[PDB]
C-alpha cells in the first residue's frame, strides 16, 4: 500500500454506517446487534411501523389499557382472548 494522492478513491457501495436489516429496516450502529433481531422476530396485531419521512418508529398503544382511564360511563374495548 503506497499512499499516493493520484489514487482512485471509491466510497463503499452499501453503507456500513447504516447496516439495514435483512427482513426489515431496523437500523443500528453495529450489525452484531442486528443478528439477534432476525433471530427473534423474523423466524399482537400491529407492533410498529417505520416512516420514510421522519425515520422514527411509531408503536401501538399497550395491551394493558385497563390502566388507561375510561371517560363518561364508556369502557375501552379490547380484543378477546381468542388464541388459547
Amino acid at each position: 500500500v503506497v499512499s499516493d494522492p493520484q489514487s482512485m478513491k471509491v466510497t463503499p457501495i452499501v453503507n456500513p454506517s447504516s447496516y439495514v436489516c435483512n427482513v426489515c429496516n431496523a437500523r443500528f450502529s453495529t450489525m452484531s446487534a442486528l443478528s439477534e433481531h432476525l433471530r427473534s422476530d423474523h423466524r399482537n396485531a400491529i407492533r410498529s411501523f417505520l416512516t420514510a419521512w421522519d425515520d422514527i418508529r411509531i408503536l401501538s398503544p399497550d395491551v394493558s389499557s385497563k390502566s388507561l382511564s375510561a371517560y363518561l360511563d364508556s369502557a375501552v374495548a379490547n380484543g378477546p382472548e381468542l388464541i388459547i
Binding site: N15, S18, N25, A52, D55
Partner: peptide, 10 residues
C-alpha cells in the same frame, strides 16, 4: 424525494 429520503438512500 422528500417523502422517500431513507428509501432512496438505502
Amino acid at each position: 424525494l422528500q417523502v422517500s429520503v431513507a428509501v432512496f438512500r438505502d
